[PDB]
Design a protein around this ligand. Structure first.
Ligand SMILES: CC[C@H](C)[C@H](N)C(=O)N[C@@H]1[C@H](O)[C@@H](CO)O[C@H]1n1cnc2c(N)ncnc21
Ligand SMILES: CC[C@H](C)[C@H](N)C(=O)N[C@@H]1[C@H](O)[C@@H](CO)O[C@H]1n1cnc2c(N)ncnc21
Lengths: 274, 274
């Protein structure tokens, strides 16, 4: 049974040289899968799995190609994502496929994505990103250890006001200088949570309130975080009121698909199934 | 690593009542996955797994819908195929998805195919089909026991002149009246193999010649059939000359993609990945 996500495109604002030599002038986005496009107003940072190994996937700019060279000339965009998600994107028309030459002979056509190279999540910690809707001009890639490489793209945007997981993981960074030292996390990469949604019995900073209610102490308390995640998801969909954006004042249930449609129209997001 | 197939659409020429009550006036195709679109000239019958359980999938006539009713009004076509392949088709835009109502609540969107019902392969034995390119006006569904429900659509068209598997399975039908009796196979459903490809050291009926060379005695001789299959595939791609069609006289390697493009343009075939 597949699930529908919104893939959010976070533009790399300054491409580091270790990527620039491989992507050669192309726009590069880190792409994240979310069920909650309506929370983009509250993004504070991006999350990656430090030991996750990600692809640099050639993508269509805002039919299966016969030649690598033609695909390389026609596509000026790269998506950083798990290879797994890249194939799903390719089936869905989001990135090109080519008739691969890497095995067998010409008697069979073997469709393959075009991956320029690999990157470890750790190498991206600290990269500045332009993200949609958030008031921050730049947000930064930080480590999260609970990320599954088997889900979405393996890259996750952070809205700590309204995700218990994001709140716990960011608090882990804020309170452990041995964590910040290990990955050289600068202070200026750690941005304050933003009030974006009112939950009429809880206030405007609901993820923090629920982490306390469930007595969650770290981003590893999986069973507890699972209950918190599920409660905040249902409660906010049916009762949460947006206090930001075009649909400020409206319930999430009434605004969510309009927000999502706008992100898609504006080129910040895509529909993604897996 | 995905493979590229051509899905061949075989139109049901007379829809039996047990299907007609479910599909209600819609065109119905049995859809088959093949690597060899150039052999459509030699189709003699269609194969199904008697105990395979197939879906009746609503399909686009020659974006995810919110309502079942709208999808039902907009789609006048049904594809018989495995559910597994139907999902792959849906990801690739070949059949519609809807936002399902079958579980959970409105706070999540769960894309689902629209399956009108199930059919067992056995119930379809004897159904007359209009198939592309073959000189036969109608060909008929027959049982093949080696079919994998995990591959393609679980439905396979038959070209016994140039598929060792098809030759063995049809010969099993021709020589076992206990097989024909069990499934009530009429004589007039068993059509003669057609000469379609010359292999310059082998002649015009190469699959039969190879089954003898490998001493294959039934459609179950999997290891032997695997070697035969692989030899005929490579040999015919590089050395086989078509004696039928627009590209008669040309080598398969030079004609195959033009034949395939034509089937697609004419609405007889689609590109399918899995
Ligand atoms: C306020 C929500 C904020 C932006 C929140 N941060 C969010 O977008 N969460 C993602 C998604 O909505 C949720 C349920 O599918 O899992 C997260 N997710 C997506 N890919 C993931 C992965 N690879 N590993 C762990 N969680 C993942
Ligand atoms: C002359 C070729 C004639 C039409 C030949 N009959 C052909 O089209 N063969 C299919 C395909 O080309 C081959 C390799 O993928 O497996 C058959 N195939 C496809 N789906 C299958 C399934 N579910 N189970 C077993 N074999 C399958």
């Amino acid at each position: 049974g597949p699930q529908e996500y919104t893939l959010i495109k976070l533009k790399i604002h300054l491409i580091p040289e270790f990527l620039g030599s491989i992507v050669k002038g192309r726009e590069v986005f880190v792409v994240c899968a979310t069920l909650r496009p309506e929370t983009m107003y509250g993004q504070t940072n991006c999350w990656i799995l430090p030991d996750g190994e990600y692809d640099l996937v050639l993508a269509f700019d805002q039919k299966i190609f016969d030649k690598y060279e033609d695909t390389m000339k026609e596509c000026n965009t790269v998506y950083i994502c798990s290879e797994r998600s890249a194939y799903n994107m390719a089936y869905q028309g989001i990135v090109p496929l080519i008739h691969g030459r890497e095995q067998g002979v010409s008697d069979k056509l073997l469709p393959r994505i075009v991956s320029l190279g690999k990157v470890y999540g750790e190498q991206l910690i600290g990269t500045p990103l332009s993200a949609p809707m958030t008031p921050y001009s730049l947000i930064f890639i930080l480590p999260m250890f609970s990320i599954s490489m088997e889900k979405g793209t393996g890259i996750v945007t952070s809205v700590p006001s309204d995700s218990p997981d994001d709140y716990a993981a960011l608090r882990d960074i804020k309170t452990k200088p041995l964590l910040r030292e290990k990955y050289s996390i600068k202070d200026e990469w750690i941005l304050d949570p933003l009030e974006i949604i009112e939950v009429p019995g809880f206030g405007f900073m609901t993820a923090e309130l629920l982490c306390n209610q469930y007595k969650i102490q770290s981003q590893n308390d999986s069973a507890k975080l699972k209950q918190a995640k599920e409660e905040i998801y249902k409660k906010e969909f049916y009762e949460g009121i947006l206090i930001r954006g075009k649909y400020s004042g409206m319930k999430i249930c009434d605004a969510k698909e309009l927000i999502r449609e706008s992100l898609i129209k504006d080129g910040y997001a895509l529909i993604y199934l897996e």
